[model samples]
Target: AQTYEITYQNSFEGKINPNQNHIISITNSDKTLLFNEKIKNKKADFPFEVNEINRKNNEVSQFAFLNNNEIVKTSDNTILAKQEFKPTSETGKILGYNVKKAVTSVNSNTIEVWYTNDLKVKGGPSILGQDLGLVLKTVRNGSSVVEATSVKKIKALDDQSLFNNITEKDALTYKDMIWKSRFITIPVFENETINFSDASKSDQVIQRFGNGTIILKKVKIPEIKQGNTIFVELKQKSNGDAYDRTGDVFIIPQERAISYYTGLTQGVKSLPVYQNGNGKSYQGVALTPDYLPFIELMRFFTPFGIGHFNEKIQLKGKNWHNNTPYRQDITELRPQLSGKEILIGAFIGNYDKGGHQISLELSIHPDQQKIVNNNFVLPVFNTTNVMEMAGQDYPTMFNSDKGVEVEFILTKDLKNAQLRYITTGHGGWGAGDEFVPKENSIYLDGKLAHAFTPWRTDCGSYRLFNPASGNFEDGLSSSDLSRSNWCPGTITNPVYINLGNLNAGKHTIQVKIPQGAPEGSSQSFWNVSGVLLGQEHH
Candidate 1:
């Protein structure tokens, strides 16, 4: 049997860089048809070349195609057989074929199509117009006609599969979709057990750096050529200790050749030390990319939560489901994570059997277009010691009125500058700073830049995640108390202080806080981190 094939092109009078033309073919043995792309302008000749789209230059580029005798429209596949297209009394002759006109108004545009069934051909719509015939010509907005330029008769069909339905299938699953798209997910520690006391080493790809409290892995992140939305996704469930504890997820930069990876694996002895006056020393709890042992990714507080602990609490009217959902933390990393070959890890300070099982991944969503101006990030300081159990003192520097100060030298002019700061107070007892509100002052170049208090009152909303919380005489659950900037089972968000722009030179930043004093043997501390983000001028 012979098939009728037609070629179509567009003319815009004086338009340049026009879209590629397409072809439509019809096989009338049983009236099956197919749409064409490669018969058009594209660059997919070889593997290394990028393909470009060149559709017919129609203001309304949408088309209709037949799928197994069912008529459908393009770009979101809506069935069109049910739609009514009015027939018109207009007639025309194109390529020696008599055509009947059909008119329809779609999306504020009037479409007039002239088609013919002289060959008794069954096909799709929008190619020439809607109907069961070969489209000879189509006009939108009454101008710029998209008519078939040439027609040919070929003997026999070479590719029978082209006649298949044009319906597109959705991704099988969300993970399948994310994995197959431009998004990226780097799993640092998935399904891994981490505890301060009892977890034995596992044979997973990301293993515990040295102890049970932290899981460390070296990953090379892709340098995507576009702007990105970065997030650190963390889910945790307690395996043993039924108490809330501080935790950290961070990336160690080796740009300076020394990192927490050294003190984390080698020993805290060789790490940088800071003596915060009067017989106190922070072994390696400072930050500066030059030795930025801990450029933290996220700071999460493990709830009195799941696994072995979720079964321990039995408050009078509260039911902690035997198998409760994990406490999840999905916080923004906006300008925190850039592409690099770096070491990443997660930590929880608790000494118990099995510890906490955590799953952490760096999720990145790239912008559709390329990023012309990339932001520059400088790791300033972090007081959260991932090595707290490794003899590193609690970040108690806030106790002094001097607070903490650090200097950074910008070698070039930068714009849109800002500071990303995160802070949390702790001292578990009644008279501690954890239960009080205190304002923190951020100073730039020896001058105050911002003053804000970090406090969260939404602790009660996450009661389900803290199964082991205490029911007190005040009729309040332990997790219900308003805390300083953070709550159990929650992740603290960063505060961005507008720094506007910076001139090339050395600059100083200081953090001052009226941190609470110790009550007997009890001491108060604040876990803080800061980083500078901006676009460096070329």
Candidate 2:
């Protein structure tokens, strides 16, 4: 509660009334006060008033030369461009003639003011004499003597030549005290979808709605796509363990969610599978920790194409109607499970039985109890340069037919990196099993689109990505490595392959996607791993 005193004088008679001295003292009774004893263990508004004081700065300033101050006092709401003034002019007389004029701009509005030459000092209302009318005291914020009434009792002043830094770094005002954070929007290729299995119905809906929902984890988004400042180092398992889980354990796993969002995975075709609400594993796959690069790369090449998103990408719990029919023409699945594999394959086209583009979607961290589901998609990447065939976009030639060879040049390098891989058409689930590069690999061959192939290439320092995808460092084929199944149990580094005992250096890693392996036919996942693979302290 606040107390104040007000003296009302009748100015109608005008000036000089020494006999009239009215002093009214008003004390607030029964003040509404709330004090929490548990907080400070003491009685008083001190604890609660801590925040109140900071909040009070937001209060409007009164008795200001700027009418905004009066407007603030009366309205109790803040306005833009609030200003202060200090007018300077030769002391003189004006109106009955004994005053000075000052020039200044207040609250973005221009005004000129006159002050009594007799009472020469840097002061205004509230302090000018109480009885004789010339005492000019500064007004208090939130104090009861209403400024609107106070200013009207006095002459207005306009002195724009004032320099003040209310919002300076050292002395910030209320407005500067506010802060903001920035975020990024992940884009899904809406204009780009493969027409497999005659998605006319899907097309109608897609044309109406658009591509799959971009699920970015509010829980954990990699700073790579979110920020360009790269922090590269071998991922030691001990290090990854220190990170905290934002919400819940299953709500969003730090590794998988970040991996899926970043576009980093273990292998191609082996989608990153996340647990359902019931904790049952799903078939979608994704490359953990590596998803960002691919997403960023897609952003660079297609400008509008968004392989990954964060802001607009929201997670929603889903008890998807079990019998939900395949809504899209064809659906793709990417997972972030124990194994590094992403499912990638297209459906048969309507007229041409080929080129039916298929894609996979992966959800990041999901709130199991709440059933919050995130949406992510694995994109198909393939080119015609490597496949020994004519440069054609014909619907018939798009299928990942066997005997087709693909050559891919890495924009970066992979010397001491582990490249997990997955592929369709090649049909093998072994690390060593690979599609070997043949001498006369040409068009229309039977041995095309084979998954068992050499994923890493030899450019400098005899470099080679691990045989985790399907094939070899050399002399190793997918069929060769195919026996029972790769890592036949709970993953205990079942198929760990070192790129090489390498020196820190720069190089390019090239991959040759086999022929017959159509677009979306095969995919791969690779990550920078070491002692710091996926560590989290808590």
Instruction: Using TM-score, give the best candidate's number.
Output: 1
Per-prediction RMSD in angstroms?
Answer: 8.3, 24.6
Error of 2 at 357 (Å): 14
**Top model number, lDDT:** 1
Give the 10-residue window scoring lowest on summed lDDT in candidate 1.
46-55
Instruction: List the global CA lDDT of all models.
Output: 0.67, 0.22
**What TM value does model 1 have?**
0.70
| Residue-by-residue lDDT tens digits, candidate 1, 1-538 | 4566666665454242266536455444443344455622332221111111112211111223222342222331233444457888888788898888888877778877788888666343243343436677777887656667777787755543423333332424322332434467877766777776544564556656446777788787776444555667777777777888888888776766667778877778877776656467776555654676467777778777655664466656666643222222222333434557777888888777767787777776656433334367777788887887676778888888767777678899989788878899888888898998889999999778999988899999878777888889988989999999998877787787888788999988889889898998889888888877788787
What is the RMSD, in Å, between candidate 1 and the native fold over all Cα?
8.3
lDDT of 2 by residue, 100-202 (tens): 5444454554443444434322222221211121221222221222111121122222112221212212213222222110122222222233222233323
User: What's the count of clashing pairs in each model shown?
Assistant: 4, 115
The deviation in Å at residue 315 for candidate 2 is 34
Clashing pairs in 1: 20-54, 64-125, 195-212, 455-485
TM-score of each: 0.70, 0.20
